[PDB]
Amino acid sequence: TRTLPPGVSDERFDAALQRFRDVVGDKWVLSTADELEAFRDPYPVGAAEANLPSAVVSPESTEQVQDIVRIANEYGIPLSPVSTGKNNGYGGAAPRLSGSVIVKTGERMNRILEVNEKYGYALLEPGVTYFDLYEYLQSHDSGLMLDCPDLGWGSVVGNTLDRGVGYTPYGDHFMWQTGLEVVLPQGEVMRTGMGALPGSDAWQLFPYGFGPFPDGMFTQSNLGIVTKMGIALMQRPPASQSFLITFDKEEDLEQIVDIMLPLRINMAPLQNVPVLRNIFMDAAAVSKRTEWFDGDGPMPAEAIERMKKDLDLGFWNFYGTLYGPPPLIEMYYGMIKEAFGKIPGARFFTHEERDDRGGHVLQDRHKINNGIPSLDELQLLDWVPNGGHIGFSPVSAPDGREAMKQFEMVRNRANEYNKDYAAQFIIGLREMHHVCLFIYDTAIPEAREEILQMTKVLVREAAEAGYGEYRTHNALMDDVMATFNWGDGALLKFHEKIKDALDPNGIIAPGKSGIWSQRFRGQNL
Amino acid sequence: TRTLPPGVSDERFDAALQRFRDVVGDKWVLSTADELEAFRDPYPVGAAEANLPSAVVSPESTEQVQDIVRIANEYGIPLSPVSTGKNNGYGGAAPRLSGSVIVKTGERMNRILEVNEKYGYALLEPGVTYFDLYEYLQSHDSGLMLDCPDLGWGSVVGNTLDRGVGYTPYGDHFMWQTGLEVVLPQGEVMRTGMGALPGSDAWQLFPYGFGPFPDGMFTQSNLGIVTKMGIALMQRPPASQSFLITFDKEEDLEQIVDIMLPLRINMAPLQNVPVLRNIFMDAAAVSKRTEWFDGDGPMPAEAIERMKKDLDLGFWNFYGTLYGPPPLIEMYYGMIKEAFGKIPGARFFTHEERDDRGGHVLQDRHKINNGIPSLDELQLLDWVPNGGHIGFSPVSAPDGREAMKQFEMVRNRANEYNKDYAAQFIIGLREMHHVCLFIYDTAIPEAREEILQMTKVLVREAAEAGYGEYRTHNALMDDVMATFNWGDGALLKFHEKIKDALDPNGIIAPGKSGIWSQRFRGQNL
Numbered sequence A, B: 001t002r003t004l005p006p007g008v009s010d011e012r013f014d015a016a017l018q019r020f021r022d023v024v025g026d027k028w029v030l031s032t033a034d035e036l037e038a039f040r041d042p043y044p045v046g047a048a049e050a051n052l053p054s055a056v057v058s059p060e061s062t063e064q065v066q067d068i069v070r071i072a073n074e075y076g077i078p079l080s081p082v083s084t085g086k087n088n089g090y091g092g093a094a095p096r097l098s099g100s101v102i103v104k105t106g107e108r109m110n111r112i113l114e115v116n117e118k119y120g121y122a123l124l125e126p127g128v129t130y131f132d133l134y135e136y137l138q139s140h141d142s143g144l145m146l147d148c149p150d151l152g153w154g155s156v157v158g159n160t161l162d163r164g165v166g167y168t169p170y171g172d173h174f175m176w177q178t179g180l181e182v183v184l185p186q187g188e189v190m191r192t193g194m195g196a197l198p199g200s201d202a203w204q205l206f207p208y209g210f211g212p213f214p215d216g217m218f219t220q221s222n223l224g225i226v227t228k229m230g231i232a233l234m235q236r237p238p239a240s241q242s243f244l245i246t247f248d249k250e251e252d253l254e255q256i257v258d259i260m261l262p263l264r265i266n267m268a269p270l271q272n273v274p275v276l277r278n279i280f281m282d283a284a285a286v287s288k289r290t291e292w293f294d295g296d297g298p299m300p301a302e303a304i305e306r307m308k309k310d311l312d313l314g315f316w317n318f319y320g321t322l323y324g325p326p327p328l329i330e331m332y333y334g335m336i337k338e339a340f341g342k343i344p345g346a347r348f349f350t351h352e353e354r355d356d357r358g359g360h361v362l363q364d365r366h367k368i369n370n371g372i373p374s375l376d377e378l379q380l381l382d383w384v385p386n387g388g389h390i391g392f393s394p395v396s397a398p399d400g401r402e403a404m405k406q407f408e409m410v411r412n413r414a415n416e417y418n419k420d421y422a423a424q425f426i427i428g429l430r431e432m433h434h435v436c437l438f439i440y441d442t443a444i445p446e447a448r449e450e451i452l453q454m455t456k457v458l459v460r461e462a463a464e465a466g467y468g469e470y471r472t473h474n475a476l477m478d479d480v481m482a483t484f485n486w487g488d489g490a491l492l493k494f495h496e497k498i499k500d501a502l503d504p505n506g507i508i509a510p511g512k513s514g515i516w517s518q519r520f521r522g523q524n525l
Ligand SMILES: *Cc1cc2c(cc1C)nc1c(=O)[nH]c(=O)nc-1n2C[C@H](O)[C@H](O)[C@H](O)COP(=O)(O)OP(=O)(O)OC[C@H]1O[C@@H](n2cnc3c(N)ncnc32)[C@H](O)[C@@H]1O
Pocket: A081, A082, A083, A084, A085, A086, A087, A088, A089, A092, A093, A105, A126, A148, A149, A150, A151, A153, A154, A155, A156, A157, A158, A159, A161, A162, A163, A164, A165, A166, A220, A221, A224, A225, A226, A227, A377, A378, A380, A389, A512
């Protein structure tokens, strides 16, 4: 069965494809089953096929994006914009609504438009990856550093548009975004902030401009197709030092988090975004499950102890990085050792003190925390055959008790559905993103189904407990949006009203973040 | 003539007033000319009467705000929400559209809902002033400090809603805003972020929630009436030190800014928001114009030399504050002395070194920069009889040539229209808010029209040079918004569409930020 936009005939679709090829050129429109396989979710969730694209269109310019959008409006064809389309764990490039055309802006709009050394920023097209920006900065001998997520192959822009995160002091990517250019759902182009002022040099200097401040509305959003974005870049410090603290017990989570808060809330002595990773996360980065346990079920405790002993890691492993002149690093490290050294069984290691296998994660963090992009974390996906993951990502207060409750709630469903729970707390000033990655064999229909059902349960149970997700998978966007329903779904109704006003024909990424335009509401898509 | 809402009769307005009284109480609805005098712009702009309220309603609660909004929809009555209505320099409490009813939320919705010591936040109603919050923190022996603008009588909430600024490291108020509750234009209530998740404790912990991030759309905005807002609060550091650098020559501006940028962009050694104030700003804070000059026209060079010599101040005066352990402060201050000391004629003073009349501004800044609110700056308005100001507030790159260009441009016109130009550059990481206060005799219709005409010319002339304003007066909002016209006025068209979608009846603060709903567009008020 050929994949078709909803309500659009074989004939009408064929004509639209031709219109698209007129805009972007023949090579840059894909529509055959073989070509579209590469744009399916690499880590499919649920037994049944879902999230099927009808085509991929690769524009080279904003003008072409505007014409594509105009064509889509005429035919009623949905358009799902992506940058590099590496949102793996949340759907990959795949559209929320089957039958949508992917607009893969980053294939050809991949220019670094500006890196400004004096004011420390970049103006970027969506195709710029973190590796690309890294190469630029190195080549020019920049005094700037980037902030990258765990995997460097994504888009500086794309990641920011999903409010993704890295681990330097610039880790909150949307916080550092300054200025954007967007194609709105009927094809009009708009610049935000000081970019709305012709001839301004301040587009990447002052984010707000004048009047209502809208850039946030284009994040986790279906209100347009972004074609340019600025981002502030931090100055590279003179020196840095990373460290690991291993903690022996599952139960240490509470005290680790409680001790952490006062050292983090003022951005010193914990300067970077610390990560607190469980043994499953760290073992999966350097080893296969079968090294520790052959068995269909939850890993017994003795296999867990062997993981820890062989990798010389704790159940909970805390990684951080310090920056500045060497005497500042030594003061801050001293404080960190003193505070966390109050937990029995804690041991400390700098990035100069491990050369073993279990220390590979530390060396990888030391790269990432210094703005050096890496793909070593891809090795997690070799944990089991045909490995995929999904991200269940609740927000947590920086409170040890809350963090333990979340860990216990997630652990228990993980056990019930037979899926390993790899945990990574990403610690902001006043909150943590509690990222729960579930690694599974994507070829087994039953495992894909258990992933879906387990995660649907976790979203509901976490919400009954007062926790919501910061970000989620295509498969869960409706369920997650249904949890933010204070005042009888006030927030959703507001988003629908705006959606319907800007997108009267229901073209752009319908269903993103549970937000469906009028023509799609009330349906089972 | 009685001031009446456009298109609304005496009889209908009388009916709507009684309904307002049914909601809030007779005592809480003001509608006589005498009662309304105190809600006129205290620093009026233009010779002709403008910005006339028809009434003032003071609601006790969110529910009452909802009822008021419902009434105003049924009767076609525009509503102008304020918190404390101290937006002096930009309109005071007066509505952009004459005939609107002011909803003074802050009169009775003035509760501190929560101050959380552990996570460092406050949840506030709109009537909490900076003084009120300071008093709370002092009374409870808090380890937190607030961040305040120059005058403490404003609203933590109201100031943030106009994207106002203060001077500690938390001086970007909008950056630290975390969660809000808002009554939308037809009377529905919504909570943003994690507050949309029933029972979440993270409303003031994690700003974004899930899906498109909307809070910024309620700043400089007419999309709702805000009833609660969260803000982060910084921990008080163990020590601080403030300093003043005087620079003798107007031409020193370029070099000052160019030396400043590398000391600021990393937040160290310039940790706080420095301010660079000219002699007219500082002299006006401590003296009357007639002490220095009592002739016609702009002050002569000799008179300016006298202000400087008598006050022991420069033409340009740089104020900053340093925070932390004493050895860190000393290291940072040594670095600041070394850099700025290259400018011939620069002199340095700490808050411990000057107790004279000229040093009164340094003493005030030492309070403000440590979150101690003050009203001493109100003395600026005694510079001339019936004194008032208007703020012309262009954004500048943190570049000396740019700042110098802006200063000369503004000075040329100030001189041409015989208005004294007091300057305060407010220095962010990558930008400056170049606040130009023109102080004038508000009683004289000539002076008020010259203010109006001069500022209109400056808005145009700045925009021709590629500069736009971050914030502006009622009288200038149309003109300022007209400058942000990239892409054939795309930004404004986008705002108008959202406005019409959320506010089908055109009720909330029509004209705020140049954004008029359909029923008022093209009418010229
Ligand atoms: C499997 C995995 C994933 C992962 C990770 C570790 C592992 C093992 N670590 C991450 C980390 O440390 N931090 C983080 O933010 N994410 C992490 N992930 C998830 C994922 O790898 C990355 O976030 C990746 O960077 C995201 O993919 P990409 O950068 O390629 O972004 P995209 O797929 O193009 O876009 C994502 C969504 O944003 C909207 N979007 C994107 N571009 C546009 C344009 N131009 N216009 C409008 N909307 C756009 C779409 O919603 C798109 O789906």
